[PDB]
Amino acid sequence: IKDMFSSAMEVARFEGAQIKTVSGIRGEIKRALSKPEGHYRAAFEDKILMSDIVILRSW
Amino acid sequence: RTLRFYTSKIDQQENKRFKGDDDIPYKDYYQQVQRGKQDKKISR
Amino acid sequence: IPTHAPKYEENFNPDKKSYDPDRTRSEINKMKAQLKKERKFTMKEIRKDAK
Amino acid sequence: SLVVQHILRLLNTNVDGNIKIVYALTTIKGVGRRYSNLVCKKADVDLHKRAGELTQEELERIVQIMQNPTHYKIPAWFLTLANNVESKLRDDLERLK
Amino acid sequence: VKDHRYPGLTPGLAPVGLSDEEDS
Amino acid sequence: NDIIKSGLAEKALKALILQCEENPSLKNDKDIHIIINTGKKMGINRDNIPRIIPLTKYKLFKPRDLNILLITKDPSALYRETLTKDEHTSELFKEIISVKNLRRRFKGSKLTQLYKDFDLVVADYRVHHLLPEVLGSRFYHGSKKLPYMIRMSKEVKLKRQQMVEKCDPIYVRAQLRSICKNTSYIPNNDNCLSVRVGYIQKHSIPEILQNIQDTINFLTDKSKRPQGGVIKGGIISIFVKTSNSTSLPIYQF
Amino acid sequence: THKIKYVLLNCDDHQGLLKKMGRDISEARPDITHQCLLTLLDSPINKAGKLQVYIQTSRGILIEVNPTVRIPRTFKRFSGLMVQLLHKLSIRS
Amino acid sequence: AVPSVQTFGKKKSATAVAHVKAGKGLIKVNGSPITLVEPEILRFKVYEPLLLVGLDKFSNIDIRVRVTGGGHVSQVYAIRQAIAKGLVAYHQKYVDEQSKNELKKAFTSYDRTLLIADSRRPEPK
RNA sequence: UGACGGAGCCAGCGAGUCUAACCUUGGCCGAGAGGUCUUGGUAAAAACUCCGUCGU
């Protein structure tokens, strides 16, 4: 996933956080990618599409 | 060229490395149109 | 036989890093190493705090 | 009983006589194998010759080819921030504490 | 010049004239 | 010729050339393009096959000036051997490659390196449609280094018969000379169109203007179809610009 | 070698340190190896290119001495050379 | 119907199918003559059967081999196994069994892999 | 027990209407939203066998 975060430091704060798509597919922030900054790896309960949008709920 | 030149090289060859007990060495129209397009966009 | 002289640094210190001909090159290498340790240390700490 | 029949300096470069003309001229910076072949072809110097075998006029012609390529229609192609990042990292570390 | 296999040939073929053929 | 007579076109070119010397960002800009606002949609889908616009008065370039890449049909032995041996074409091409070898040796970053090294790319018309997958996106957006269709020999194809494979070195050289001296354009299904008309530091302003008139005459002349006469209904306006500079109007209806 | 800066151990310069190591200071003489190298390398046989020297350190390190080398004559400089060699694993011209 | 037999040779993932019928000594591998099999260095390997029993036996038969899978070496071994098995089977089916016994004896005496498959099955220890 | 080029040729896994760039220069249409075109830069089977060239 891209555009969620600006640097790999931000991703590290949110690793393990719950995320989901607009479709409702639930996932997790697994790890930050070294290249490029702000990208990260996630695992979802099912395969997602390129047209999907992932959202992290925070308060 | 001159024969003197060859004598110098010959003698230098005799004189021509550590030996004995030697130690190793020590150490404005364009600006107008840019404005014009900017003016058109802001006006719209 | 030809004779050559050994090349060595006096008062050699292995832990101390090699001398560099260029001060800027060493200095930037100095800062690049400093950045790496701090980034890895901060990244470790933020993960532990998050966990 | 009477029968009558090693290093050269070209373009400020020493070239071995033993080496063939084209691969001897390859040693010159900016001169490739294809470039040297083309230069020799323009110079009408037999490529099978060794660099030592070259006569003075042939060497002069080769030098003229090298120095005046466009004149002989040679093709053209043949011719602080880290500190700022450290400070930002330190600021992030301080904010973490 | 037309090639049925490649219709794109007939457009965008470099025109050739006498001056092009004659050696420089 | 009315555009050439107008002083506005002269004034725009003087300002454009002056800026490139003044502005550091435009230092690497060397080519001059004209943007034509055709009145109505051309209706031609972009086929990525360049069309040659003959510039009679002046020549933009010569083959010896540019790095030329030739992409040939497999096997490339017949074409590579014939072109290299012939005196006319012995030194015309920087590199001769086949499609299959081209796909194998150049991938990823190597394609980017291939883009920079070569100024002109030409390919056998039979393999032109394969190149977009091989050369990649970089070659095929912007129109700067699109491959040109060329024909190796004057033989023609007849249905139910097999084309004889031959390489005519003089014919290949003649086509390449035409491609380099003449400018080119690619049709698109919209008003805008870009054509290269001049090169900075090489063409004087009067020469660049003449190239524009030849470009406009050829594109508007219905008698030159299908290669020309594509701008039906006149031209609303014409601009001039470099790769990174802004558009300077030179004609407006 | 041993850090104080690293120095080649000697029987005279470093006695207390060897006692901490427990090694007997009688067998702490690198000067003998220096003296043999000077006479071996400066002998005419070496000048004729018919001699090569090896050194088996007590610890178990094997050193190959190129016949061309010119080791410093003063012992103090030689010690600086060995700490360079034992750590860098090679010496260049 | 023309008398014909079919046999298989296997080596790792390489599989060769040999069809042996009555004919005039026409031996092909993958639609090309056996002499063009590659690599050339191992060509005599695929000649092992023919030279062991002699070319006179092949003079009255045509052999067609189709090979798929594996690499060069395993394909060579598949070809030779298939050819040997095909010759033996054809001699069983349409020629006396005495000659078959001689063929089997020759192939087994030289190299048993020509007839029996060589597969290195794992064996835990 | 090299580099370059060419030529010959050999696998087995793997099939969700799903598979996938970024940053710019400008033309036109559009009340807006936006749409379309243009443009430069950045990123992104092999072994094996044979033949030819240089040469350690």
mmCIF file with all atom_site columns, N, CA and C in Angstrom, chain H residues 57-89:
data_model
loop_
_atom_site.group_PDB
_atom_site.id
_atom_site.type_symbol
_atom_site.label_atom_id
_atom_site.label_alt_id
_atom_site.label_comp_id
_atom_site.label_asym_id
_atom_site.label_entity_id
_atom_site.label_seq_id
_atom_site.pdbx_PDB_ins_code
_atom_site.Cartn_x
_atom_site.Cartn_y
_atom_site.Cartn_z
_atom_site.occupancy
_atom_site.B_iso_or_equiv
_atom_site.pdbx_formal_charge
_atom_site.auth_seq_id
_atom_site.auth_comp_id
_atom_site.auth_asym_id
_atom_site.auth_atom_id
_atom_site.pdbx_PDB_model_num
ATOM 1  N N  . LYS H 1 57 ? 20.571 -55.085 -38.737 1.00 0.00 ? 57 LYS H N  1
ATOM 2  C CA . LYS H 1 57 ? 19.258 -55.339 -38.161 1.00 0.00 ? 57 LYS H CA 1
ATOM 3  C C  . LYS H 1 57 ? 18.298 -54.191 -38.437 1.00 0.00 ? 57 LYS H C  1
ATOM 4  N N  . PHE H 1 58 ? 18.812 -52.964 -38.493 1.00 0.00 ? 58 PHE H N  1
ATOM 5  C CA . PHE H 1 58 ? 17.962 -51.810 -38.739 1.00 0.00 ? 58 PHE H CA 1
ATOM 6  C C  . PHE H 1 58 ? 17.584 -51.658 -40.205 1.00 0.00 ? 58 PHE H C  1
ATOM 7  N N  . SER H 1 59 ? 18.235 -52.394 -41.106 1.00 0.00 ? 59 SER H N  1
ATOM 8  C CA . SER H 1 59 ? 18.044 -52.167 -42.534 1.00 0.00 ? 59 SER H CA 1
ATOM 9  C C  . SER H 1 59 ? 16.615 -52.439 -42.981 1.00 0.00 ? 59 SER H C  1
ATOM 10 N N  . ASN H 1 60 ? 15.875 -53.262 -42.248 1.00 0.00 ? 60 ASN H N  1
ATOM 11 C CA . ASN H 1 60 ? 14.523 -53.640 -42.638 1.00 0.00 ? 60 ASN H CA 1
ATOM 12 C C  . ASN H 1 60 ? 13.446 -52.942 -41.819 1.00 0.00 ? 60 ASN H C  1
ATOM 13 N N  . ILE H 1 61 ? 13.807 -51.965 -40.985 1.00 0.00 ? 61 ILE H N  1
ATOM 14 C CA . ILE H 1 61 ? 12.854 -51.278 -40.121 1.00 0.00 ? 61 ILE H CA 1
ATOM 15 C C  . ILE H 1 61 ? 13.093 -49.776 -40.193 1.00 0.00 ? 61 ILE H C  1
ATOM 16 N N  . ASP H 1 62 ? 12.045 -49.021 -39.880 1.00 0.00 ? 62 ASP H N  1
ATOM 17 C CA . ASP H 1 62 ? 12.093 -47.576 -39.719 1.00 0.00 ? 62 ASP H CA 1
ATOM 18 C C  . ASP H 1 62 ? 11.761 -47.243 -38.275 1.00 0.00 ? 62 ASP H C  1
ATOM 19 N N  . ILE H 1 63 ? 12.567 -46.373 -37.675 1.00 0.00 ? 63 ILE H N  1
ATOM 20 C CA . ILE H 1 63 ? 12.412 -45.952 -36.289 1.00 0.00 ? 63 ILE H CA 1
ATOM 21 C C  . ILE H 1 63 ? 12.162 -44.453 -36.281 1.00 0.00 ? 63 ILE H C  1
ATOM 22 N N  . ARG H 1 64 ? 11.118 -44.030 -35.575 1.00 0.00 ? 64 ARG H N  1
ATOM 23 C CA . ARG H 1 64 ? 10.803 -42.618 -35.400 1.00 0.00 ? 64 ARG H CA 1
ATOM 24 C C  . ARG H 1 64 ? 10.732 -42.331 -33.908 1.00 0.00 ? 64 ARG H C  1
ATOM 25 N N  . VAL H 1 65 ? 11.547 -41.391 -33.438 1.00 0.00 ? 65 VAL H N  1
ATOM 26 C CA . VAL H 1 65 ? 11.641 -41.059 -32.021 1.00 0.00 ? 65 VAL H CA 1
ATOM 27 C C  . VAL H 1 65 ? 11.164 -39.626 -31.831 1.00 0.00 ? 65 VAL H C  1
ATOM 28 N N  . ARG H 1 66 ? 10.304 -39.416 -30.836 1.00 0.00 ? 66 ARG H N  1
ATOM 29 C CA . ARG H 1 66 ? 9.865  -38.084 -30.424 1.00 0.00 ? 66 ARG H CA 1
ATOM 30 C C  . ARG H 1 66 ? 10.229 -37.889 -28.961 1.00 0.00 ? 66 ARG H C  1
ATOM 31 N N  . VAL H 1 67 ? 10.930 -36.800 -28.657 1.00 0.00 ? 67 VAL H N  1
ATOM 32 C CA . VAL H 1 67 ? 11.520 -36.580 -27.342 1.00 0.00 ? 67 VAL H CA 1
ATOM 33 C C  . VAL H 1 67 ? 10.981 -35.271 -26.787 1.00 0.00 ? 67 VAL H C  1
ATOM 34 N N  . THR H 1 68 ? 10.595 -35.276 -25.512 1.00 0.00 ? 68 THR H N  1
ATOM 35 C CA . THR H 1 68 ? 10.133 -34.065 -24.849 1.00 0.00 ? 68 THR H CA 1
ATOM 36 C C  . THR H 1 68 ? 10.584 -34.063 -23.397 1.00 0.00 ? 68 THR H C  1
ATOM 37 N N  . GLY H 1 69 ? 10.871 -32.872 -22.890 1.00 0.00 ? 69 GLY H N  1
ATOM 38 C CA . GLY H 1 69 ? 11.190 -32.690 -21.492 1.00 0.00 ? 69 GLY H CA 1
ATOM 39 C C  . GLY H 1 69 ? 12.667 -32.857 -21.197 1.00 0.00 ? 69 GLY H C  1
ATOM 40 N N  . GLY H 1 70 ? 13.024 -32.550 -19.958 1.00 0.00 ? 70 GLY H N  1
ATOM 41 C CA . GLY H 1 70 ? 14.381 -32.733 -19.506 1.00 0.00 ? 70 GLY H CA 1
ATOM 42 C C  . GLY H 1 70 ? 15.356 -31.824 -20.229 1.00 0.00 ? 70 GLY H C  1
ATOM 43 N N  . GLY H 1 71 ? 16.637 -32.096 -19.991 1.00 0.00 ? 71 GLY H N  1
ATOM 44 C CA . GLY H 1 71 ? 17.720 -31.403 -20.644 1.00 0.00 ? 71 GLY H CA 1
ATOM 45 C C  . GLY H 1 71 ? 18.346 -32.229 -21.749 1.00 0.00 ? 71 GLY H C  1
ATOM 46 N N  . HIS H 1 72 ? 19.516 -31.774 -22.190 1.00 0.00 ? 72 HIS H N  1
ATOM 47 C CA . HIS H 1 72 ? 20.202 -32.444 -23.289 1.00 0.00 ? 72 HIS H CA 1
ATOM 48 C C  . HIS H 1 72 ? 20.596 -33.868 -22.915 1.00 0.00 ? 72 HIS H C  1
ATOM 49 N N  . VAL H 1 73 ? 21.255 -34.027 -21.769 1.00 0.00 ? 73 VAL H N  1
ATOM 50 C CA . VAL H 1 73 ? 21.798 -35.327 -21.391 1.00 0.00 ? 73 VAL H CA 1
ATOM 51 C C  . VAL H 1 73 ? 20.673 -36.331 -21.173 1.00 0.00 ? 73 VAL H C  1
ATOM 52 N N  . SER H 1 74 ? 19.679 -35.953 -20.372 1.00 0.00 ? 74 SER H N  1
ATOM 53 C CA . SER H 1 74 ? 18.588 -36.868 -20.081 1.00 0.00 ? 74 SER H CA 1
ATOM 54 C C  . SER H 1 74 ? 17.822 -37.214 -21.348 1.00 0.00 ? 74 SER H C  1
ATOM 55 N N  . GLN H 1 75 ? 17.736 -36.273 -22.286 1.00 0.00 ? 75 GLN H N  1
ATOM 56 C CA . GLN H 1 75 ? 17.085 -36.559 -23.557 1.00 0.00 ? 75 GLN H CA 1
ATOM 57 C C  . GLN H 1 75 ? 17.878 -37.581 -24.361 1.00 0.00 ? 75 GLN H C  1
ATOM 58 N N  . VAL H 1 76 ? 19.209 -37.485 -24.334 1.00 0.00 ? 76 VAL H N  1
ATOM 59 C CA . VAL H 1 76 ? 20.035 -38.484 -25.011 1.00 0.00 ? 76 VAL H CA 1
ATOM 60 C C  . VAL H 1 76 ? 19.784 -39.866 -24.421 1.00 0.00 ? 76 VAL H C  1
ATOM 61 N N  . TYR H 1 77 ? 19.737 -39.944 -23.092 1.00 0.00 ? 77 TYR H N  1
ATOM 62 C CA . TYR H 1 77 ? 19.533 -41.239 -22.448 1.00 0.00 ? 77 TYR H CA 1
ATOM 63 C C  . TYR H 1 77 ? 18.139 -41.790 -22.738 1.00 0.00 ? 77 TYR H C  1
ATOM 64 N N  . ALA H 1 78 ? 17.133 -40.918 -22.766 1.00 0.00 ? 78 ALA H N  1
ATOM 65 C CA . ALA H 1 78 ? 15.799 -41.359 -23.145 1.00 0.00 ? 78 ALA H CA 1
ATOM 66 C C  . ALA H 1 78 ? 15.785 -41.903 -24.566 1.00 0.00 ? 78 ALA H C  1
ATOM 67 N N  . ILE H 1 79 ? 16.478 -41.233 -25.491 1.00 0.00 ? 79 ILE H N  1
ATOM 68 C CA . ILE H 1 79 ? 16.489 -41.694 -26.877 1.00 0.00 ? 79 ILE H CA 1
ATOM 69 C C  . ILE H 1 79 ? 17.104 -43.081 -26.972 1.00 0.00 ? 79 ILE H C  1
ATOM 70 N N  . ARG H 1 80 ? 18.277 -43.272 -26.363 1.00 0.00 ? 80 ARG H N  1
ATOM 71 C CA . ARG H 1 80 ? 18.938 -44.568 -26.503 1.00 0.00 ? 80 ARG H CA 1
ATOM 72 C C  . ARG H 1 80 ? 18.111 -45.680 -25.868 1.00 0.00 ? 80 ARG H C  1
ATOM 73 N N  . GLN H 1 81 ? 17.531 -45.428 -24.691 1.00 0.00 ? 81 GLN H N  1
ATOM 74 C CA . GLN H 1 81 ? 16.687 -46.445 -24.073 1.00 0.00 ? 81 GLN H CA 1
ATOM 75 C C  . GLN H 1 81 ? 15.495 -46.783 -24.956 1.00 0.00 ? 81 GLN H C  1
ATOM 76 N N  . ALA H 1 82 ? 14.830 -45.765 -25.505 1.00 0.00 ? 82 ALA H N  1
ATOM 77 C CA . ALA H 1 82 ? 13.654 -46.017 -26.328 1.00 0.00 ? 82 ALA H CA 1
ATOM 78 C C  . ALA H 1 82 ? 14.014 -46.815 -27.567 1.00 0.00 ? 82 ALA H C  1
ATOM 79 N N  . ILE H 1 83 ? 15.137 -46.486 -28.207 1.00 0.00 ? 83 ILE H N  1
ATOM 80 C CA . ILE H 1 83 ? 15.531 -47.201 -29.419 1.00 0.00 ? 83 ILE H CA 1
ATOM 81 C C  . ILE H 1 83 ? 15.821 -48.663 -29.103 1.00 0.00 ? 83 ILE H C  1
ATOM 82 N N  . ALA H 1 84 ? 16.577 -48.918 -28.032 1.00 0.00 ? 84 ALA H N  1
ATOM 83 C CA . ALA H 1 84 ? 16.905 -50.301 -27.701 1.00 0.00 ? 84 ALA H CA 1
ATOM 84 C C  . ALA H 1 84 ? 15.649 -51.100 -27.378 1.00 0.00 ? 84 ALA H C  1
ATOM 85 N N  . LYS H 1 85 ? 14.768 -50.535 -26.550 1.00 0.00 ? 85 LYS H N  1
ATOM 86 C CA . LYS H 1 85 ? 13.534 -51.227 -26.207 1.00 0.00 ? 85 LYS H CA 1
ATOM 87 C C  . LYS H 1 85 ? 12.687 -51.483 -27.443 1.00 0.00 ? 85 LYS H C  1
ATOM 88 N N  . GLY H 1 86 ? 12.615 -50.509 -28.350 1.00 0.00 ? 86 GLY H N  1
ATOM 89 C CA . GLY H 1 86 ? 11.823 -50.692 -29.551 1.00 0.00 ? 86 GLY H CA 1
ATOM 90 C C  . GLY H 1 86 ? 12.355 -51.799 -30.433 1.00 0.00 ? 86 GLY H C  1
ATOM 91 N N  . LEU H 1 87 ? 13.674 -51.851 -30.614 1.00 0.00 ? 87 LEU H N  1
ATOM 92 C CA . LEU H 1 87 ? 14.244 -52.916 -31.430 1.00 0.00 ? 87 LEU H CA 1
ATOM 93 C C  . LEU H 1 87 ? 13.955 -54.282 -30.817 1.00 0.00 ? 87 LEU H C  1
ATOM 94 N N  . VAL H 1 88 ? 14.138 -54.412 -29.500 1.00 0.00 ? 88 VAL H N  1
ATOM 95 C CA . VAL H 1 88 ? 13.880 -55.694 -28.848 1.00 0.00 ? 88 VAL H CA 1
ATOM 96 C C  . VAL H 1 88 ? 12.412 -56.084 -28.987 1.00 0.00 ? 88 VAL H C  1
ATOM 97 N N  . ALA H 1 89 ? 11.501 -55.131 -28.780 1.00 0.00 ? 89 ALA H N  1
ATOM 98 C CA . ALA H 1 89 ? 10.079 -55.442 -28.856 1.00 0.00 ? 89 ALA H CA 1
ATOM 99 C C  . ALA H 1 89 ? 9.665  -55.815 -30.270 1.00 0.00 ? 89 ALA H C  1
#
